[PDB]
Design a binder for this molecule. Structure first.
Ligand SMILES: NCc1[nH]cc(CCC(=O)O)c1CC(=O)O
Ligand SMILES: NCc1[nH]cc(CCC(=O)O)c1CC(=O)O
Ligand SMILES: NCc1[nH]cc(CCC(=O)O)c1CC(=O)O
Ligand SMILES: NCc1[nH]cc(CCC(=O)O)c1CC(=O)O
Ligand SMILES: NCc1[nH]cc(CCC(=O)O)c1CC(=O)O
Ligand SMILES: [Zn+2]
Ligand SMILES: [Zn+2]
Ligand SMILES: [Zn+2]
Ligand SMILES: [Zn+2]
Ligand SMILES: [Zn+2]
Ligand SMILES: [Zn+2]
Ligand SMILES: [Zn+2]
Ligand SMILES: [Zn+2]
Ligand SMILES: [Zn+2]
Ligand SMILES: [Zn+2]
Ligand SMILES: [Zn+2]
Ligand SMILES: [Zn+2]
Ligand SMILES: [Zn+2]
Ligand SMILES: [Zn+2]
Ligand SMILES: [Zn+2]
Lengths: 323, 323, 323, 323, 323
């Protein structure tokens, strides 16, 4: 055949493939989410997330050293609360669980980058990401509280405050609150573009949220690409340090579009349902787990993410699969 | 002060800097240029390129194993000839030096990616990159010969033919010649955008070109960004597999512009004068050599290059500075 | 060969090359940086910058006339201080060295465009670009001082205030301070995009900074192109008159990208390490100095810079190489 | 007033204006058009172009040396014929005027870049830019002749063939003709975008065209910007070396648009009527001639032209106004 | 010849040319500038602008009816003052000339769109566009006065206030002043991009400005395309209703660039020197006046202007050349 162009010329050997490979994945790309339960003694398996456990508070300092020693740079803290109430007020108590997770991690590994998931769905009786009203989840009452939580997390050592509540104006509320309290240098990792996704099931189990109902009056419609971009760019305008697309794996179009619309860094969250889908299919012999995980994570990087939140991170680090 | 945006938030610690670092440099990014002299016994120091030596042919198989064992993926071959003539005909002889460099490297390390610098300036009495005429360097007579050289290099094992002659239509001539001889899978690494630069001095010494005069009737004016882009895009149209900007270090604007005008891979050559400038200033105590080299190479990557030709490559690999 | 396109047609003669040359370099493109030491009598050679000297204050008026008579349009002032302290307060004293450099230059050559490097690394005991804290270099305490320095430099005659401290919000702080003091017409040449580069070594020696440590918590990571652009565009939003990329020579991708993202003028600083690399390699015979310098400077112009800060400037002017 | 942005800051002095001036004009930017009449003895004033003269053939060698000695790089040749006929056949005679103008210029100043206006309006009885038909100016019969003329001009020494006939497909016809005759290196300066302009009056007088009628069936409508761009891009596709917008002075929108649609070089012709408008208004005291000319030429450069054809060129060079 | 594309197909007849003509010129495109001298009896010829006269105030009401009856939609008023002073204060007097020109025009032809040139160069002893200082033309003192003038022009009937002073922040000053005085509906036709051009000579004579010196510390450098665009976009940000490029004829690149950077309307001023160049060359027989004028004006329209200020306007209207 007369073909001057032959893309196969660069695919002949593993060496040629490695030379020309456009996208690289390292431990510098990963953030490890961690589940911490107060007032328990034994690690608790999350059945819907095979291989993931709730870490007892009493063991946290141990676990964070281990995470640190594998070479992981950063964790995102999630609390399982034994102190829920109508407004999630334990989350703005100086020594409530949110504060203690951050304080423990930072005291034990001072160079660990600590990001504190900042919401109320894990602290509220009713299970919603904020203050419940006759009218539904009250945006502006929730904002005030997000500010108060951010202040105590920052006071306790958190490097990033990470508002996962999907409230309008939450970046700006948290920014004003950090600054007025003297935490000008504490960063905001906004969950800027966060969809009302069906991929979050296993996280219900891991983090114990009490919600009967849905988050569709605050979290945005999966199908809305224009609105997705807009949601993120609003957060840039309010001063966030890092944007984020969540979930990630079924949203790589969104990642890429955002990448071309901002210069800020972008995170992408490989959520619990994505984790569960890989684990369960691998348990069943249907895929090779390690190859799928690397491909899934690589894809998230290819699409434009600077940082990826992954539950696989510690395992990949302890096995030296990434460095 | 009232500043909501504080870029310094992400620069606080080495860990934060590493997380947010936009550009990564690995051994998969490097090609090692090598100087091979036929019919000598001892390694010959290049004074103008401290730390670089001409490798005797008789020692090549040894050197290529060593290069391979450091983890280097690819080399670019340059010959010092003891058989020069009016047309550089040793370079299209089946068993001339060009062919033997390629044959030795590939026989000794079959997975080594071998790229053969493809010209006549090292093989001609007069020292020009081709067939000398009354009218100057004859473009089309030179093209015919480039084809013949490409065929013998490919026959001998070269993965890439790399025309450094800066002749109009050289990609297409070499492509037609490889294909008509049955080397459809042999690739073309064009020196697509190659400037008539004053940064090539030390290479005169290393490769022993006999030229008294200049290359300005073929190599393009350093100052011509529009023409630079055009020169590369012509090569894409003729079917090259990889484009290249040379020199690189004072041409990162060019790299970046090209990056946004093509999807092909792009190489960038960190030439002998750049090497010499780093080495001599470091010898004099004026800079830290290792920090400068990493920054120089990183910059070339940042600007958009997929591959970088660097004389530092083996040292960085043997020292485990890159992997 | 059948080639309708032959780029070589326009490269045949020097005359054709000159007609089609896309980028021109003149003295209107150069700013000369100058080192002035207070309370000394003899010129002091900077060993790491061959051919550069510290000029005694007592000789400044002489040197500035000479610079002026060569046709140089503008200088950037750097002081070597015999009055350092914890905060660099000599730099906001009405008659401190910063003020006197500017006053002398302007009184002696009223039409000389004077730009005053505006920082504290040359005036502080500890050697940092500002107010040292438990927490590191305090951004906002540093800003206040930058304002006070800008006011005295402007009062003394400086045409441009040039903040090289890499503090967040420094353009706006200096702007508000100049305006509130009645210096509305004094311009800001921001060192907008200034990288934590290893190319600044020889400047340690020339300007005598006391720093043991690094500037990486304020100066930005070399590898971060997105952040580089953003850093500059923030400065445009705060009202700077001119932006700047520093270093320049390994950052021409950055220059070009910025060029397409703003209409403001852009400067580019050919820093001490670039100077040293050219000088040392030329001393060693490895390159032709004059050809390299012209090519380096031309490249900076090609990439999009309106102004270039170069230590070669006076020599090129006195020799009539540029006009 | 509270204005942070003050563009006037950079306009304070001539020195500041020169530093920030975006566009520069040199002799490397100019091509001098010249009128040569065969078979006359005295220089003949063109009344409609004050200060311009027809140069007798017998004096050409003298005039071209003078032009060369002023520092002019290039001329465009126009003949006044004493041998007109139905087809303009003197223009493809080996020793016809077109050939002799080129031969004389190149023999006398071998480094002079000679461009030969390539048409038939100056050689035809009827005065049209080609072969007259019942149907009007026959495009394809004209093309054949353009080829034959190009061959004799190239044989005689012309560096550029410059088809001013505005015939469809003229670049390609001339290219094929130069190549088949062995003039592969002879360049094409196409009058790519040439409008049916009322600014060409004084050229009727200078070049003595016999036309009673108009050129509107070949030269394009002044008002058609889309078609203007398209006309030029067709010429790029046929292989021209340089494009051109003519006239220039009332067509700077066209220049700029084209500049952003191609990487080729662009010329712009400051035509006879523009020349006459400046000269007559200056004669009348209404403008300062030198200031207007510099501004007019600068504007043409600003708009994006690499080369400008100007009747003022020799005067500006002899007076050292440009260098 | 084998050419499928033949642009000449659409140029065969005048009918085909008219069908495909991309750009149309009507009286709806023209604004007529008018010179009015107070306290004179006879019309006064402007020698440098053949065919233009100063209109005595006493005859204005007559002239404006005539202008109106030719179909002209709009005039721009320029006064010749018999009451100059250090600050141009007659221009903010309730019944000063600026006010009376506007009042007369609007009272006599209520539907005439009146635009009032808004400056001080015609009202000042020293002849500058504002308040003279030790430091030169004081920007902010001038702004205050521009506000006061705008208020009296608006009070007197002006539809547009048109600040030709080239002062920083003049749109915003005039906007705030109109609004605070209750003239919210009075429009601003900013002379947004106004160059320090040598094409304004004949206007010195027509409008009698006393300036010995230049306007280069306020009017922008002809050569600065980037700054030109920026100057206009600042004016859009301050709320102007219409932007303007002046001069126009040598600035069509600027018009077109601006056209693609804003949605506002754009005016373009065909200044006195352009007028004089056409008139003097036509007087001399060198061009056909009517054909040149139509082409010049058409070109300004082609380049993107919505409105064109032309001294030819009334003549073209009275002759029914445009409608
Ligand atoms: N604020 C809630 C929160 N923060 C993190 C996630 C899910 C993360 C995962 O599924 O791994 C959720 C749950 C939800 O929003 O419905
Ligand atoms: N075909 C010549 C060739 N191939 C490689 C280089 C220089 C590479 C270097 O300087 O490291 C040169 C020399 C030149 O082109 O003038
Ligand atoms: N404010 C510091 C300053 N201003 C100028 C430079 C270096 C200029 C050169 O290297 O020529 C430096 C040093 C540094 O930032 O580390
Ligand atoms: N082929 C004709 C030709 N070549 C140059 C010009 C005019 C150049 C000038 O007016 O200076 C003209 C005349 C026309 O096309 O009508
Ligand atoms: N404010 C001055 C003003 N307003 C109109 C013009 C010139 C208009 C013309 O030349 O037709 C000028 C003169 C100048 O700015 O120097
Ligand atoms: Zn409890
Ligand atoms: Zn929640
Ligand atoms: Zn939101
Ligand atoms: Zn031998
Ligand atoms: Zn060569
Ligand atoms: Zn090429
Ligand atoms: Zn002292
Ligand atoms: Zn400093
Ligand atoms: Zn900054
Ligand atoms: Zn004859
Ligand atoms: Zn013609
Ligand atoms: Zn055409
Ligand atoms: Zn009076
Ligand atoms: Zn004025
Ligand atoms: Zn303005």
């Amino acid at each position: 055949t007369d073909l001057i162009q032959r893309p196969r010329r660069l695919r002949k050997s593993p060496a040629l493939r490695a030379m020309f490979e456009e996208t690289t994945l390292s431990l510098n790309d990963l953030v490890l989410p961690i589940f911490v339960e107060e007032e328990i003694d034994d690690y608790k398996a999350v059945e819907a997330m095979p291989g993931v456990m709730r870490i007892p508070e009493k063991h946290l300092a141990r676990e964070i050293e281990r995470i640190a020693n594998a070479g992981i740079r950063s964790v995102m803290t999630f609390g399982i609360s034994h102190h829920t109430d109508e407004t999630g007020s334990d989350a703005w108590r100086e020594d409530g669980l949110v504060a203690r997770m951050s304080r423990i991690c930072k005291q034990t590994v001072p160079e660990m980058i600590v990001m504190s998931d900042t919401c109320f769905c894990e602290y509220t009786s009713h299970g919603h990401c904020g203050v419940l009203c006759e009218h539904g989840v009250d945006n502006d009452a929730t904002l005030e509280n997000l500010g108060k939580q951010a202040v105590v997390a920052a006071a306790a050592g958190a490097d990033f405050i990470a508002p996962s509540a999907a409230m309008d104006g939450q970046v700006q509320a948290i920014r004003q609150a950090l600054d007025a309290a003297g935490f000008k240098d504490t960063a905001i990792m906004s969950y800027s573009t966060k969809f009302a996704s069906s991929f979050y099931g296993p996280f219900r189990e891991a983090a114990g949220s009490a919600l009967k109902g849905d988050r569709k009056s605050y979290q945005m419609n999966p199908m809305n690409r224009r609105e997705a971009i807009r949601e993120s760019l609003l957060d840039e305008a309010q001063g966030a340090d890092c944007l984020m697309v969540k979930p990630a794996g079924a949203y790589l179009d969104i990642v890429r579009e955002l990448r071309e619309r901002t210069e800020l860094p972008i995170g992408a969250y490989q959520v619990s349902g994505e984790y569960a889908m890989i684990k369960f299919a691998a348990l069943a012999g249907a895929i090779d787990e390690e190859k799928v995980v690397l491909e899934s994570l690589g894809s998230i990087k290819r699409a434009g993410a600077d940082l990826i939140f992954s539950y696989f991170a510690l395992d990949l680090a302890e096995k030296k699969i990434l460095r």
